[PDB]
Structures are given as C-alpha cells and as structure tokens.
Amino acid sequence: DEAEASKFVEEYDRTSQVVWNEYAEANWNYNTNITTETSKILLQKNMQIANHTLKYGTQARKFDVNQLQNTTIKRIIKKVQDLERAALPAQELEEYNKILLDMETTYSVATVCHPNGSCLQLEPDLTNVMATSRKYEDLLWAWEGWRDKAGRAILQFYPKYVELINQAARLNGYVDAGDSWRSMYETPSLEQDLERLFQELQPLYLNLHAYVRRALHRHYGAQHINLEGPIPAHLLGNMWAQTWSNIYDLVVPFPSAPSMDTTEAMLKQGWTPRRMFKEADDFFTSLGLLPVPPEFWNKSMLEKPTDGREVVCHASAWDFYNGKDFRIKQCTTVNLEDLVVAHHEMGHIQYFMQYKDLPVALREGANPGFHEAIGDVLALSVSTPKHLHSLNLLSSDEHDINFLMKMALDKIAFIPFSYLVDQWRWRVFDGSITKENYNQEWWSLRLKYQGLCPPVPRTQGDFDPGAKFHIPSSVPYIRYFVSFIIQFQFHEALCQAAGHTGPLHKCDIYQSKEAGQRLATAMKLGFSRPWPEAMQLITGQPNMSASAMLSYFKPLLDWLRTENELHGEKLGWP
Ligand SMILES: NCCCC[C@H](N[C@@H](CCc1ccccc1)C(=O)O)C(=O)N1CCC[C@H]1C(=O)O
Numbered sequence: 001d002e003a004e005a006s007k008f009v010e011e012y013d014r015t016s017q018v019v020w021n022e023y024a025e026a027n028w029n030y031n032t033n034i035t036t037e038t039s040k041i042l043l044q045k046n047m048q049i050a051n052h053t054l055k056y057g058t059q060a061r062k063f064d065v066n067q068l069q070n071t072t073i074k075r076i077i078k079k080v081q082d083l084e085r086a087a088l089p090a091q092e093l094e095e096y097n098k099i100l101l102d103m104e105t106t107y108s109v110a111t112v113c114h115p116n117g118s119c120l121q122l123e124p125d126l127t128n129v130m131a132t133s134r135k136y137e138d139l140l141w142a143w144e145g146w147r148d149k150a151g152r153a154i155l156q157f158y159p160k161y162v163e164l165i166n167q168a169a170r171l172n173g174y175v176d177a178g179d180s181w182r183s184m185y186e187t188p189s190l191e192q193d194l195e196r197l198f199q200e201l202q203p204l205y206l207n208l209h210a211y212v213r214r215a216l217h218r219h220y221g222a223q224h225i226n227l228e229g230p231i232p233a234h235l236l237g238n239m240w241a242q243t244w245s246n247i248y249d250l251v252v253p254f255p256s257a258p259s260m261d262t263t264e265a266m267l268k269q270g271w272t273p274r275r276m277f278k279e280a281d282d283f284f285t286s287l288g289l290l291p292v293p294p295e296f297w298n299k300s301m302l303e304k305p306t307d308g309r310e311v312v313c314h315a316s317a318w319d320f321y322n323g324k325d326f327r328i329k330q331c332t333t334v335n336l337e338d339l340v341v342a343h344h345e346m347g348h349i350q351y352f353m354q355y356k357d358l359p360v361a362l363r364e365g366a367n368p369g370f371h372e373a374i375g376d377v378l379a380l381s382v383s384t385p386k387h388l389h390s391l392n393l394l395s396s397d398e399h400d401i402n403f404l405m406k407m408a409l410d411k412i413a414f415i416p417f418s419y420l421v422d423q424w425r426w427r428v429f430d431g432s433i434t435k436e437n438y439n440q441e442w443w444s445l446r447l448k449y450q451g452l453c454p455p456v457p458r459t460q461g462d463f464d465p466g467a468k469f470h471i472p473s474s475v476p477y478i479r480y481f482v483s484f485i486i487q488f489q490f491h492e493a494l495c496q497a498a499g500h501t502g503p504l505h506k507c508d509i510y511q512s513k514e515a516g517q518r519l520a521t522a523m524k525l526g527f528s529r530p531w532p533e534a535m536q537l538i539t540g541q542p543n544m545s546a547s548a549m550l551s552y553f554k555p556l557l558d559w560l561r562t563e564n565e566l567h568g569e570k571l572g573w574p
C-alpha cells in the first residue's frame with residue numbers, strides 16, 4: 001500500500017509538470033494578448049488540466065491517508081484529493097471557467113470616458129489622476145467612473161461565481177469557498193490570530209488616520225472634511241485608498257526638509273522598466289540568492305504592449321512548472337511605487353526558483369503570506385533614504401519622521417484594507433451576505449476598519465468590490481494582511497542577522513549573506529512543512545507578531561500622539 005503510494009506520487013508529479021506547463025502557456029498567451037482566439041484556447045486547456053486533476057484526484061481519494069506512513073507522501077496525497085474546480089460536473093465546470101474568464105476580461109478592458117471621446121484605462125491613466133489630482137471633483141469623476149464601468153459590470157457575474165465556487169468547495173470537503181481558502185494556512189485559530197494582530201495595529205492606524213484627516217481638512221476645506229468622522233474614499237491618492245503614499249506632499253511632518261522628486265529623478269536619468277527589474281535582481285544576488293534565468297529577460301512582458309493587443313496589466317509573476325521558465329507580466333511605469341512592485345514580483349520569482357526541485361504539489365510558499373512577503377522585505381531596505389541616494393534618486397530626527405511617515409502611508413494604511421477584503425468575501429461565501437447586501441456590507445466594513453466613506457452615495461446596481469482586481473480575478477486577499485505583518489518580522493530578524501544596530505527603520509540588508517541564507521533555507525521548504533517552521537528558521541520563533549512592525553514605527557507613533565494631542569484630535573469616527 002505504501003509502495004503504491006510513492007509510485008502514485010511519482011506519476012502524479014511527472015504528469016502534472018507537463019499538463020501544468022501547457023496550461024501556463026495558454027493562460028499566459030491570453031493574459032498577454034486578449035483575443036477571442038486565445039480565450040477559446042485557454043478555456044479548452046482548462047478542460048484538459050481539469051481532466052488530469054480528476055484522474056489523479058479520484059485515485060488519490062482511494063488511499064486511506066490515515067494509514068500512510070511516509071509523511072511527505074501522506075501530505076502530497078491528502079492535497080491531491082482536493083480537486084478544486086475539477087470537482088464540478090462537466091456542465092458547471094465550463095460555466096465556471098467562462099464566468100472567471102469573463103470577469104477578468106471585463107475588468108482588464110474597462111475604460112472611463114469623458115463627453116468628448118477621451119477614454120482612460122485604469123493603468124496608468126486613472127491611476128495617475130488618483131495620485132496627482134488635488135481637485136475634489138476631478139478625483140470624484142475618476143473614483144465614481146471606475147466603479148460605474150468596472151464595478152457595475154462585474155455584478156451580473158458574481159452571484160453565479162459565488163454559487164459555483166462554493167459548490168466546488170463543498171464537493172471537496174469544505175463548507176464553502178471561504179473555508180477552502182482559509183485552509184491554505186493550516187491554522188485552526190487563523191481568524192482569531194488575524195483579529196488580534198489587527199487590534200494591535202489599531203492605535204497606530206487610528207493616529208495616522210486622524211493626522212491625515214486633519215491635513216485633508218486643511219487642503220479640501222472644513223465643509224468637506226468632518227474632523228470627527230470618516231474620510232472620503234477618493235482623497236487618499238489611490239483608487240482604493242489602500243495606500244496613501246501619493247498624498248505625502250499634503251501631510252509632510254517637516255516640510256522644511258524637502259525631499260527629491262523620486263519619479264522626476266528616475267525619469268531625469270533614463271530609468272527604464274528593465275533597469276528597475278535589473279536593480280531588483282541585483283539586490284537578490286547581493287544577498288547570495290538566485291539570479292533570474294536569461295530566459296526570464298527574453299519571455300517576460302515588463303512593458304505595456306504598443307502593438308494593438310490588449311493585455312492584463314495587473315502585475316504578476318509566473319511559474320511554468322519546468323524549473324526553468326519563470327516570467328513577470330507588468331505594464332511597468334517608471335516611478336518609485338512600481339519599483340517596489342517590481343521587487344514584490346521578483347520576490348515571487350525567487351520563491352519559484354528556490355523550491356523548483358520539490359514535488360509540484362509542494363511548490364508553494366510556507367503559506368500564501370510568505371510568498372507575498374519576500375519581495376517586500378528587500379524593498380523595505382531599498383526604500384531607505386540612504387539606499388535611494390545610492391541609486392541617485394535622493395539627495396536626522398526630522399528626516400526620520402518624514403521617512404517613517406512616507407512608509408506608514410503605505411504599510412500602516414494598508415493594514416485595515418488588507419484585513420477587510422476577505423472579511424467581506426468570507427461572509428459572502430458562507431451566505432451571511434446576499435447579492436442584495438453586497439455593496440452595503442462592503443461599505444460597512446470600509447467604515448468599520450478603514451474609517452472611510454463613499455464621496456457619492458451608493459445606489460442599487462453598484463458593486464464597488466468588483467472594481468478591485470482581486471475580486472473578479474478570484475485571488476484571495478488575506479495573504480496581503482499576513483504579508484504586511486510578517487515582512488516586518490522578517491526585516492527585523494534579517495537586520496539582526498546582518499549585524500544591524502540602532503533604529504530598525506535605518507536598516508538596509510543590502511548584500512548581507514547571513515540575511516540571504518535565512519531566506520533561502522526557508523523558501524526551499526516550499527509547502528513541505530507547517531509554516532511555523534519556516535517562520536522559526538527566519539525569526540527564531542514560530543508565531544506571527546505585530547511587534548516588529550510596531551517597533552519599526554515606534555518613533556512615528558510617539559510623534560503622532562504628540563501631534564494629534566496638541567491639536568485635540570478625536571481618534572476614530574463616532
Ligand atoms: N500597481 C499594481 C501592483 C499589483 C501587484 C500585486 N499583484 C499581484 C497578483 C495576484 C495574482 C495571482 C494569480 C493570478 C493573477 C494575479 C501579486 O500578488 O503579485 C498586488 O496585487 N498587490 C501587492 C500588494 C498588495 C496587492 C494590491 O495591489 O492589491
């Protein structure tokens with residue numbers, strides 16, 4: 001029986017590599033050239049890989065995992081018993097695949113037009129408007145328009161999507177899709193753990209929220225900002241107000257200390273998307289980590305195509321399951337924000353390369369959060385004033401607070417948003433939220449967690465969640481909340497391993513081999529062991545903890561309390 005098991009695993013692995021490699025190809029061609037032809041081929045490739053999944057999934061279920069001795073074989077087989085979408089009857093499977101395809105296409109090709117004929121795409125057009133406009137009505141036009149065109153257009157597909165993905169989940173042993181997704185963490189206390197983590201960052205977020213609200217009151221007027229209420233969702237410099245980095249100019253703690261125009265600097269000295277990824281590649285190798293293969297530069301799409309073809313711009317990293325072909329798909333824009341994204345994506349590629357020799361079923365991060373944290377960890381060091389100056393993009397207490405504020409506008413502001421997304425989806429999946437209350441419950445959470453309000457009252461027909469990539473693309477979001485917490489835990493440990501002393505925010509792990517070694521040993525484990533082990537390998541302890549992030553921002557927290565206190569700010573939104 002045990003002999004049949006290891007043989008099954010071997011056959012599953014060698015056959016999966018081939019089928020998954022072929023699927024990755026068709027999926028890539030569609031993402032990089034949305035045509036009715038590539039669509040048709042992809043949907044056909046869907047059925048083929050589903051066929052393979054059903055064949056081996058059916059076999060795997062015949063094994064009594066409880067009686068399997070080898071833990072690795074036991075772990076792989078248990079995982080293969082989950083057919084995911086392939087568990088759906090043929091009819092439902094094709095409908096589900098088409099549903100997903102249509103939602104993704106609808107989102108990626110949506111445009112917002114003016115009365116003339118000027119239509120803007122999300123990236124970089126609408127994104128730039130949200131980041132640079134300081135006119136309430138212009139920001140509103142883009143904010144509302146995007147939701148009218150992308151959000152509303154997804155609503156017709158969602159209820160069916162929810163029904164089918166939940167059905168698939170039940171056919172695989174779970175109670176609903178949310179249950180299935182949370183299982184990726186293999187942590188029964190997950191919901192409580194995440195709740196405790198969120199609560200620990202509340203003091204910091206609430207103080208940042210009040211400070212920013214005051215600055216907005218200063219700029220947009222008392223008639224448009226309630227000093228004791230939520231902040232209008234279109235004023236944070238980002239379409240989803242998930243990161244507030246772009247309004248740094250409106251909230252700079254010490255304006256007497258001017259900061260260079262980072263974007264102007266990159267452009268001023270000919271930085272290109274390729275340069276950007278080359279710098280990221282250099283940081284990884286400096287740590288002793290792996291460089292991306294030559295093939296990466298030849299097959300990746302680092303720029304928005306200008307040959308008439310429509311593509312999915314939303315940045316992503318791809319593993320073609322042959323241990324050789326890895327690629328990034330990003331309509332890269334030359335600015336600091338995308339430089340961080342490039343590192344984020346390169347972090348995924350590094351993970352792909354580190355565990356490429358493990359059985360395919362175990363080729364994943366310790367948990368989804370780990371996969372998301374890698375690139376961000378390095379980017380933390382890249383973002384330091386001193387590091388940016390070494391790249392010639394930049395030229396002290398007050399400077400520390402200014403830097404910490406810039407970092408907080410990104411990292412701290414994101415905490416409540418990254419927490420909120422799946423709190424909403426989990427309740428949609430378990431049936432607590434019906435299509436009648438999709439939007440209203442989304443905004444109840446936007447208010448409760450982020451303290452934001454819609455600048456325009458929502459009406460029947462609106463489906464704002466659909467205006468956020470991950471929703472129509474069906475990509476879990478809690479991984480980002482986990483990532484933002486643990487990436488600071490990783491930064492703290494790697495900095496200590498690198499011999500750094502003094503304030504954590506001043507640490508730059510560039511070219512530290514000790515740091516790189518901890519990340520490598522952890523990444524090599526892939527999904528072979530419970531994530532707490534990878535956590536231990538990197539940090540010396542096994543739990544998730546907000547301590548590192550709180551320690552990183554401690555100076556800012558103190559500055560924020562003193563500043564908000566002297567202005568008599570009322571934290572929160574009664
Ligand atoms: N200026 C846009 C940059 C996007 C980069 C990043 N991309 C995503 C992609 C997710 C994906 C999974 C499977 C298939 C297709 C896509 C990523 O995690 O790399 C992302 O979404 N991130 C990175 C952090 C948070 C989250 C976001 O922006 O909400």
Ligand SMILES: [Cl-]
Pocket residue numbers: 240464465
């Ligand atoms: Cl929204």
Ligand SMILES: [Cl-]
Pocket residue numbers: 184368369476477478479480
């Ligand atoms: Cl996740």
Ligand SMILES: [Zn+2]
Pocket residue numbers: 344345348371372
């Ligand atoms: Zn990612």
